[PDB]
Design a protein around this ligand. Structure first.
Ligand code: MG
Ligand code: MG
Ligand code: MG
Ligand code: MG
Ligand code: MG
Ligand code: MG
Ligand code: MG
Ligand code: MG
Ligand code: MG
Ligand code: MG
Ligand code: MG
Ligand code: MG
Ligand code: MG
Ligand code: MG
Ligand code: MG
Ligand code: MG
Ligand code: MG
Ligand code: MG
Ligand code: MG
Ligand code: MG
Ligand code: MG
Ligand code: MG
Ligand code: MG
Ligand code: MG
Ligand code: MG
Ligand code: MG
Ligand code: MG
Ligand code: MG
Ligand code: MG
Ligand code: MG
Ligand code: MG
Ligand code: MG
Ligand code: MG
Ligand code: MG
Ligand code: MG
Ligand code: MG
Ligand code: MG
Ligand code: MG
Ligand code: MG
Ligand code: MG
Ligand code: MG
Ligand code: MG
Ligand code: MG
Ligand code: MG
Ligand code: MG
Ligand code: MG
Ligand code: MG
Ligand code: MG
Ligand code: MG
Ligand code: MG
Ligand code: MG
Ligand code: MG
Ligand code: MG
Ligand code: MG
Lengths: 148, 58, 51, 185, 50, 159, 223
RNA sequence: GGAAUACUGCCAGCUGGGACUGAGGACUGCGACGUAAGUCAAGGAUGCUGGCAUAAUGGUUAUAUGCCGCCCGUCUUGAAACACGGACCAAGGAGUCUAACGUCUAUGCGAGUGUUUGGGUGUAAAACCCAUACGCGUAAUGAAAGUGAACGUAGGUUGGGGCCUCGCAAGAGGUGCACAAUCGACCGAUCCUGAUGUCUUCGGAUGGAUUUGAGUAAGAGCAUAGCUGUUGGGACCCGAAAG
RNA sequence: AAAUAUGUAAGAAGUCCUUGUUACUUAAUUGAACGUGGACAUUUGAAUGAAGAGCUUUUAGUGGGCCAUUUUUGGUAAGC
RNA sequence: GCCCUGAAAAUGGAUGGCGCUCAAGCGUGUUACCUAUACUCUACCGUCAGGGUUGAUAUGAUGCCCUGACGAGUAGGCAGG
């Protein structure tokens, strides 16, 4: 709200809060990003290195989520199993009745290997796995089932 | 329209407003620029002395 | 609430440092030295009045 | 006149009450301004301060940060204080008993803590059990973790992180970032 | 101009944007309309299911 | 145009001492430098390699590195309103152990010892330096010494 | 508790009675310590004269300093020194221990201050009338001996004349005792400065610099 | 030869005249005088006496008298200026709103978070309710193909609040979150090493390197709101010669 | 070859004793770094002061200057 | 040394004026005296700092209370109204 605003406290002092020498004027230095390569160069490398010039390959008609492979770390994994149904398998570790986890169903597309999972077998099915994700699932008596 | 060219007038006053101090000392300081091959081998004396001091915890 | 000076107002003088009581009582803001007879050597006054 | 050596009428740079208006918070604050005034016990004097802090200075203590702090030797039976809120962490499985005094618990946090046979008490509940902080283990969250502080100190060669609204290549990635385009930071 | 350490914005308002501004005051209004026309379509469409 | 080259202004600074030109003696190469050592800097202009820049002339710093033919010295340089920290790579010909640092260590040893002997009598010490005190009373004697008394001298030209 | 109060209250009237007599014992002693020492230097001079020699005194261990310049238009160095000697407003004063390392401060600071050697008399009236102590940043008058003991007790010093003693004799805890004393806020001299202009040297025609013994007559009109 | 006196300094020696002040509002402190009862100038004034009632006193106003005081506003190193604007009065008259943001603060929930496109509903632009998605966040790195975060109690060292143990204390030992400095480990880029294998060109284990990254190493974010700051907008208000 | 200005030092991040690590280094259990264990806490290593120390984030105005002592360049000089 | 000459400009005028000659001039010394928004003590306002205090105890806990220090200000920042 305006009543809360400095321009109310400035009422009665000349020049608002903008000096007597330097004025408040229409665009000194120019509108927008003028002369990033000239009179504004310092600010534009420092605060913004990289800005100017090209790098890398063009790609015509790139369609986002051709590249849709959301990631899931072992770090969690056991979250994709309903809170309650979870301790069931957790206390009864077995290659007999190991919980099948469909990660594609959960919206992911690649299991990444960050973290530690407890030593309890799991059927993990996903498109794509990190080499270590597999190595840690296998470590605790599980497997990876590649799906699509 | 010639104008004043240069001076260091007041520049001392300005520097001493909140200024000088020194520049912050640290036991275990920055090994920036210290001889690589001295460093490399030092990594290993360090691995050892630690590893060695594990021979007291178990 | 009010700083009282001990060099006036004998009471606050006595609060700080007693002995003032004996000091005053035994004079000794005067008190005489004991007389002696040390006379200055002849060389001393030769040099005083020299040139 | 006086040759001053110091800025006159300078106020300490220190919060003196909470900024908040939370009635209840001013009561906790009223509690410990009494406890810290009328006891010694360093612990109170600390919490009384910690109560004034802003939401950045009170980053969340996690449930796993608690689980780990209890693995400290001679810790397990201490009661961990978190003048701030405690969140839940899906990533620990074994979570010990112990009683945790905080300001707020997320749903899942007091869930974990209780189901492990443990307690979740408010601070004034703590205050009565331990007027002097007996067996309390104060915990603070990772402050320098904010997305905000990534950009603090942004400068050439500072290694920090640009304020760039929308990232990728073509986004501040060329001149001044590689020896091949002008130079490198 | 360019100054301070701020993100580089790209707010496209150089074009008489004000001439083509659509504020949806009739959000409430056209919800009622949208209903007073589903009921009234259900009415004439007899026991059929819309 | 103005000129501000790297060795500008140093016509006398990087000059050799009078009748001390040519070959730098071998004491300079036999001295051994450890990290943490405190060294004075003073360029030898005949050793053009590994010279300090003219600023660092006469400055004193600490060794942070010992390489083959050089030491790395850390200098605290004032720039603006803050001290900045500088890494210098100087050949041994431009460096010198600091005497006042060698005196300090001598006084540390000296202080340990005085402390030994003292405690090996349980007695007190005073190990820290006091500054030059006033002066206690004296009695000058006048024997052989009857004060020759002086006076001011009249003006007198002599050209 | 009605018989526990007088039980502690008169357990303090007891305590206060003893301290009060200890002080007496000390103050009475100090007197003679002075009385004798001053006497000694007198006859030492008479004796050396008698034997045809010259007794020469010990150089003064103590000076008192009064800033007599205002605060503006002072050069950085002496300005700094003026502060480190706690003399940051006109007519304030402090005591300084004379050693080489303070002696050169007084040099640097000289055309802004007037100093010399304080008598017991002056040091006594200065502390009595104008002595305040520094406690928790605060400037507290020395109304009762309790205040000094509370703060200087750890060093000896548990009366005002204990303070005075530690000052005029200089020695052990001069640093602390003297720092305990707030800078003295003197008035302008009642009776004038005795000189047409103050900011020449005392030798040149008055004020500023070491006026030696003469400091006392000044400070007595400022006190 | 024996004195005085001047000069200088000291007295916790005595004492007269004048001036300004009288803050505080039970007690509590330190004392002092007393053989004691008790008294006191001892942590801030009381006593006695008088005067004023169409009045003493005080506020305001006018005038006189003493001293003092150039015209404001502005740009400016410098304005009372022989710089500009302004004869007088009233009413109008200038940092806004919006889209996207920085920092900080408050609040909700929290590894999540955002009901409002829309649907439901209504006492009808409100309030109450809601399914699927979507957005931002929880993954980085590389130009890309791509690959993708525990040797270790998620490491070592050094400070480190608080807590614990001993102590009557002082102090000593233990544990030490946040934060800081440093060494190391992990993921991607780069340059090497190139095992077991294979279809002889595929594959890329392992171990490295003064290289490198807006990373990892028991998550902090998402959303509403406010001040200040940012960009575009008529963009604080009024102003061209032009096109 | 001054005066005035000007670098650094005046300890716990220290000192000494024992001996552990390493692929560096040495003819070499030699060194060099970094440590374990032990010893010294009264002045722990000059003075004075400290109105507290450290630290982070963000943002205003400014970016025409002028004057005096001294030093000093151009100019006959200048309120240059 | 002081004084005299050297010593010429334009409205009428300036040791500030009057006026001053063993000065009310020049050099020097000695006392007293006058006077700033500065110094000393005290009251009051505010600012900052440090404390004390709701144990049950008529009406302000962001409040009451004790203590110390400090106060110039354009452009400008912030706060309280
Ligand atoms: Mg304002
Ligand atoms: Mg202003
Ligand atoms: Mg105006
Ligand atoms: Mg203007
Ligand atoms: Mg990618
Ligand atoms: Mg994760
Ligand atoms: Mg120009
Ligand atoms: Mg010019
Ligand atoms: Mg300029
Ligand atoms: Mg992150
Ligand atoms: Mg870098
Ligand atoms: Mg648009
Ligand atoms: Mg445009
Ligand atoms: Mg419409
Ligand atoms: Mg339909
Ligand atoms: Mg040149
Ligand atoms: Mg030259
Ligand atoms: Mg020489
Ligand atoms: Mg070459
Ligand atoms: Mg008189
Ligand atoms: Mg008088
Ligand atoms: Mg005189
Ligand atoms: Mg005069
Ligand atoms: Mg006086
Ligand atoms: Mg007298
Ligand atoms: Mg009263
Ligand atoms: Mg009247
Ligand atoms: Mg006038
Ligand atoms: Mg006006
Ligand atoms: Mg002009
Ligand atoms: Mg004007
Ligand atoms: Mg004019
Ligand atoms: Mg104009
Ligand atoms: Mg008008
Ligand atoms: Mg109007
Ligand atoms: Mg409903
Ligand atoms: Mg650990
Ligand atoms: Mg127009
Ligand atoms: Mg036109
Ligand atoms: Mg055109
Ligand atoms: Mg210096
Ligand atoms: Mg700024
Ligand atoms: Mg700026
Ligand atoms: Mg600028
Ligand atoms: Mg300008
Ligand atoms: Mg000068
Ligand atoms: Mg003529
Ligand atoms: Mg004349
Ligand atoms: Mg003359
Ligand atoms: Mg005369
Ligand atoms: Mg004269
Ligand atoms: Mg005269
Ligand atoms: Mg006044
Ligand atoms: Mg002010």
């Amino acid at each position: 709200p305006s009543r809360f605003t400095k321009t109310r406290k400035h009422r009665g002092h000349v020049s608002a809060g903008k000096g007597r020498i330097g004025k408040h004027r229409k665009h000194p230095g120019g509108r927008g990003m003028a002369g990033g390569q000239h009179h504004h160069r310092i600010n534009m490398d420092k605060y913004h290195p990289g800005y100017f010039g090209k790098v890398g390959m063009r790609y015509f008609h790139k369609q986002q989520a051709h590249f849709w492979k959301p990631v899931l770390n072992l770090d969690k994994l056991w979250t994709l199993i309903p809170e309650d149904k979870r301790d069931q398998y957790l206390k009864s570790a077995s290659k007999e009745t190991a919980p099948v986890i469909d990660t594609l169903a959960a919206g992911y597309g690649k299991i990444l290997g960050k973290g530690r999972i407890p030593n309890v077998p799991v059927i993990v099915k996903a498109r794509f796995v990190s080499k270590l994700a597999e190595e840690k699932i296998r470590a605790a008596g599980g497997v990876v089932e590649l799906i699509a | 329209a010639k104008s004043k060219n240069h001076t260091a007038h007041n520049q001392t006053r300005k520097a001493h407003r909140n200024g000088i101090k020194k520049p912050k000392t640290y036991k275990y300081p920055s090994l920036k620029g210290v001889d690589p091959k001295f460093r490399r081998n030092h990594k290993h004396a360090l691995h050892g002395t630690a590893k060695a001091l594990a021979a007291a915890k178990k | 609430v009010l700083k009282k000076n001990p060099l006036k107002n004998k009471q606050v003088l006595l609060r700080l440092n007693p002995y003032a009581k004996v000091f005053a009582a035994e004079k000794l803001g005067s008190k005489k030295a004991e007389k002696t007879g040390t006379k200055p050597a002849a060389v001393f006054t030769e040099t005083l009045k020299h040139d | 006149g006086i040759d001053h050596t110091s800025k006159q009428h300078k106020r300490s740079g220190h919060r003196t009450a909470p900024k908040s208006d939370n009635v209840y918070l001013k009561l906790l604050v009223k509690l410990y301004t009494f406890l810290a005034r009328r006891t010694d016990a360093p612990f109170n004097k600390v919490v009384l301060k910690a109560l004034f802090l802003s939401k950045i200075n009170r980053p969340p203590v996690s449930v796993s940060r608690i689980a780990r702090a209890l693995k400290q030797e001679g810790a397990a039976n201490k009661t961990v204080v978190v003048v701030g809120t405690v969140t839940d962490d899906a990533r620990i499985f074994e979570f010990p008993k112990t009683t945790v005094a905080a300001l707020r618990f997320t749903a899942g946090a007091r869930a974990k803590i209780v189901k492990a046979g443990g307690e979740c008490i408010t601070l004034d509940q703590l205050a009565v059990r331990a007027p002097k902080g007996q067996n309390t283990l104060i915990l603070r969250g990772p402050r320098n973790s904010r997305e905000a502080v990534r950009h603090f100190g942004m400068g050439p060669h500072k290694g920090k992180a640009p304020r760039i609204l929308s990232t990728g290549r073509k986004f501040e990635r060329a001149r001044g970032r590689r020896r091949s385009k002008g130079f490198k930071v | 101009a360019i100054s301070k350490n701020l993100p580089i914005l790209k707010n496209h308002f150089r074009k008489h944007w004000q001439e083509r501004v659509k504020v949806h005051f009739d959000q409430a209004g056209k919800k009622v309309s949208r209903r007073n026309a589903r009921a009234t379509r259900a009415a004439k469409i007899a026991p059929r299911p819309l | 145009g103005k000129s501000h080259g790297y060795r500008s202004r140093t016509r006398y600074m990087f000059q050799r001492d009078f009748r001390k030109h040519g070959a730098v003696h071998l004491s300079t190469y036999l001295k051994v430098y450890k990290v943490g050592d405190i060294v004075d800097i003073k360029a030898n202009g005949s050793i053009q390699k590994g010279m300090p820049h003219k600023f660092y002339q006469g400055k004193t710093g600490v060794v942070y590195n010992v390489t083959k033919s050089s030491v790395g010295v850390i200098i605290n340089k004032m720039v603006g309103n803050r001290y900045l920290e500088k890494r210098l790579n100087l050949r041994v010909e431009h460096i010198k152990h600091s005497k006042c640092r060698q005196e300090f260590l001598e006084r540390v040893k000296a202080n340990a010892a005085k402390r030994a002997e003292a405690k090996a009598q349980g007695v007190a010490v005073q190990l820290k330096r006091q500054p030059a005190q006033p002066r206690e009373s004296r009695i000058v004697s006048t024997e052989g010494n009857v004060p020759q008394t002086l006076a001011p001298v009249p003006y007198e030209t002599f050209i | 508790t009605a018989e526990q109060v007088a039980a502690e209250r008169a357990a303090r009237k007891a305590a206060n009675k003893e301290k009060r007599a200890i002080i007496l014992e000390r103050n009475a002693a100090y007197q003679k310590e002075y009385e004798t020492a001053e006497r000694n230097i007198i006859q030492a001079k008479r004796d050396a004269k008698a034997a045809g020699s010259y007794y020469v005194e010990a150089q003064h261990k103590l000076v008192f300093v009064v800033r007599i310049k205002g605060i503006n238009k002072i050069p950085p160095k002496p300005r700094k020194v003026l502060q480190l000697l706690r003399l940051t407003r006109i007519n304030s004063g402090t005591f300084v221990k004379v050693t080489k390392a303070t002696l050169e401060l007084l040099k640097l600071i000289e055309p802004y201050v007037a100093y010399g050697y304080p008598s017991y008399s002056t040091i006594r009236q200065l502390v009595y009338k104008r002595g305040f102590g520094k406690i928790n940043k605060q400037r507290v008058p020395l109304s009762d001996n309790a205040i000094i003991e509370a703060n200087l007790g750890k060093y000896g010093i548990l009366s005002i004349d204990d303070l005075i003693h530690e000052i005029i004799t200089v020695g052990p805890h001069f640093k602390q005792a003297n720092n305990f004393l707030w800078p003295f806020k003197l008035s302008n001299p009642s009776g004038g400065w005795g000189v047409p202009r103050k900011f020449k040297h005392f030798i040149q025609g008055g004020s500023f610099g070491n006026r030696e013994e003469f400091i006392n007559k000044l400070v007595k009109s400022m006190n």
